[PDB]
Nucleic acid binder design. Structure first.
Ligand SMILES: Nc1ncnc2c1ncn2[C@@H]1O[C@H](CSCC[C@H](N)C(=O)O)[C@@H](O)[C@H]1O
Lengths: 237, 321
RNA sequence: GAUGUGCACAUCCAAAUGAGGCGCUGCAUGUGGCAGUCUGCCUUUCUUUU
């Protein structure tokens, strides 16, 4: 596997139990806010956010189209809680059907808000990045910077940060948690392109805090509140 | 003695392969018995099985191991062995006697189950389903106890243990609930939908593309060629360095081959218009491919996957709108 | 996840699954399918302890 996609760590459990992260974050920014989530593998974090904080909408996005199928298996796992042997649920599938809304219906009920879309977020061209429009209120980009970095260089990484600047509405924030520099070298021999772009790195994980403040992207102010957790604010109104 | 233990292991494996259980379940060895005169089989056939290979390859030591034995007999030479007790119909009580067990530690061995269940009752037959021949236990097992009282004892003795009939009833309940949910949602999708000789031969439409690098995918080539003219077919083998394109009008093919800017400078390709014998052979290839795709039977797709893909796509459409 | 050397270098392993078995239509179709068929049916399963 090249992109960092793991089919592992599947979760039977409902939102009540989560994989650590959610005690760190604060729920104040989520409520009544459109959210994009980059680098989600099965949404074990995405569903467990949407389950309690009640975000108005939440679109997870991942590159592995094979794995978003298992994310949708995990979303249909919650509806069918209405014991059963695991040998049968492994072979058939979960009981419930994929919850489709009526035309006249009430959103923001779990799970009717969230949808999982498969796509590639790095468009590789600055002209396509400049054409985009703001659509979201909070963007989560955590544990992603390493793999996009090694796969598409500082060119694709600049393209991704310039796209995240284009998709925030005014008042919309960015959450970040980057992988340190010490890790990358253990993954250099996976393919040829990863090794070449690893020996073509000119940008360190520290100067991220410089580069997003730089006018080439345009984020206005930032803070870190306790790998670190960075909060970036676009300028108000 | 170790030789004594190997003789005992040969005796146990032969008495299991000739026990009532494995003779009722396995069909191959029962056909080996049935397709003979006087009901026999050579020991050399028994050597070829996988678990016999770990113990002994000498057949005379096997014949010595079958001297003192409950149910097997030998005729003259110690090279053939017969059942010694005639077999009839399958018992009905075994379906009630069967025990289903769940949550295995994933180290699967026939001796593993025999150790953990042998103290409770006489274990006679084990079924462990392998992960599609990947040599991995799926995580559940079927253990058959004898005389149907020890099975009811072992259910009380215990990592998740239940009967066969209770498993079958839970299976029917599960399957009926999924059929009801999918029937209702099938009706919902139907209500939402309710409320809301082949190609003609044209000369000069065949563009052959030769490349130094291997060609990108058919979606990439189709997006490349469709943005300039109207494409009818992209003939492209995965991994080939050459490909073909069939277009609607020859003016479309002319607009493609005169698109030196958008094609040949971006991708190191040589695109020409085939004519004459090359075009005739290519249209014969079109006819052969059409007759082949027609003569092929239709691909099979499961109904539940098709229905869940349709519902997923309508979910994305109604959320984006 | 582990190993050798003095957290650093080098090497090894990554695959915690789900689409696995088999059809019927009635239209299209080198166009890479579409609409149905009880969720199309079945799964202890594409199993050799032959
Ligand atoms: N170019 C890209 N654009 C968006 N997502 C990508 C991407 N390349 C890789 N990814 C995804 O990023 C994921 C990082 S794994 C990170 C764990 C996840 N955030 C969690 O909390 O559970 C991978 O699963 C990979 O599929």
């Amino acid at each position: 596997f090249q992109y960092g996609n793991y089919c592992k760590y599947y979760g039977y459990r409902n939102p009540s139990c989560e994989d650590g992260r959610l005690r760190v974050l604060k729920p104040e920014w989520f409520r009544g806010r459109d959210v994009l989530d980059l680098g989600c593998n099965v949404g074990h974090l995405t569903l467990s956010i949407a389950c309690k904080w009640g975000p108005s909408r939440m679109v997870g996005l991942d590159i592995d189209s094979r794995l978003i199928h298992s994310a949708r298996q995990n979303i249909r796992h919650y509806l069918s809680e209405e014991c059963f042997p695991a040998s049968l649920t492994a072979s058939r599938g979960p009981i419930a059907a994929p919850q489709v809304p009526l035309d006249g219906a009430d959103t923001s009920v779990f799970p009717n808000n969230v949808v999982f879309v498969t796509g590639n977020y790095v468009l590789d061209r600055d002209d396509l990045v400049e054409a985009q429009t703001p659509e979201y209120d909070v963007v989560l980009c955590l544990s992603l910077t390493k793999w996009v970095h090694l796969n598409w260089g500082d060119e694709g990484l600049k393209r991704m940060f310039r796209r995240i600047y284009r998709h925030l509405r005014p008042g919309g924030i960015l959450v970040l948690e980057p992988q340190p520099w010490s890790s990358y070298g253990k993954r250099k021999t996976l393919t040829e392109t990863i090794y070449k772009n690893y020996y073509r790195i000119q940008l360190k994980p520290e100067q991220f805090s410089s580069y997003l403040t730089s006018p080439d992207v345009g984020f206005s102010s930032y803070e870190l509140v306790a790998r670190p957790v960075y909060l970036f604010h676009k300028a108000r109104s | 003695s170790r030789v004594k233990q190997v003789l005992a292991d040969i005796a146990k494996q032969v008495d299991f392969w000739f026990g009532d259980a494995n003779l009722h379940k396995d069909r191959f060895l029962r056909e080996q018995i049935e397709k003979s005169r006087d009901g026999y089989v050579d020991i050399s056939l028994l050597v070829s099985f996988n678990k016999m290979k770990k113990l002994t390859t000498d057949g005379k030591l096997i014949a010595r191991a079958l001297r003192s034995s409950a149910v097997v007999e030998l005729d003259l030479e110690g090279t053939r062995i017969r059942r010694k007790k005639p077999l009839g119909e399958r018992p009905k009580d075994e379906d009630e006697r069967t025990v289903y067990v769940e949550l295995l530690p994933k180290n699967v061995n026939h001796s593993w189950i025999e150790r953990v269940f042998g103290k409770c009752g006489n274990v006679v037959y084990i079924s462990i389903p392998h992960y599609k021949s990947t040599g991995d236990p799926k995580g559940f097992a079927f253990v058959e106890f004898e005389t149907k009282e020890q099975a009811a004892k072992a259910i009380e003795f215990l990592l998740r243990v239940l009967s066969k009939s209770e498993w079958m009833d839970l299976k029917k309940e599960y399957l009926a609930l999924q059929k009801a949910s999918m029937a209702s949602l099938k009706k919902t999708i139907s209500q939402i939908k309710s409320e809301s000789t082949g190609p003609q031969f044209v000369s000069g439409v065949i563009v052959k593309i030769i490349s130094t690098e291997p060609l990108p995918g058919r979606k990439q080539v189709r997006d490349t060629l469709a943005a300039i003219s109207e494409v009818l077919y992209v003939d492209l083998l995965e991994g080939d360095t050459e490909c073909h394109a069939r277009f609607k009008t020859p003016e479309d093919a002319q607009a493609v081959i005169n698109a030196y800017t958008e094609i040949n400078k971006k991708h190191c390709w040589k695109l020409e218009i085939l004519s004459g014998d090359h075009e005739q052979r290519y249209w014969q290839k079109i006819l052969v491919d059409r007759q082949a795709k027609l003569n092929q039977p239709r691909e099979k797709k499961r109904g539940t996957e098709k229905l869940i893909t349709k519902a997923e796509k309508i979910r994305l459409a109604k959320t984006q709108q």
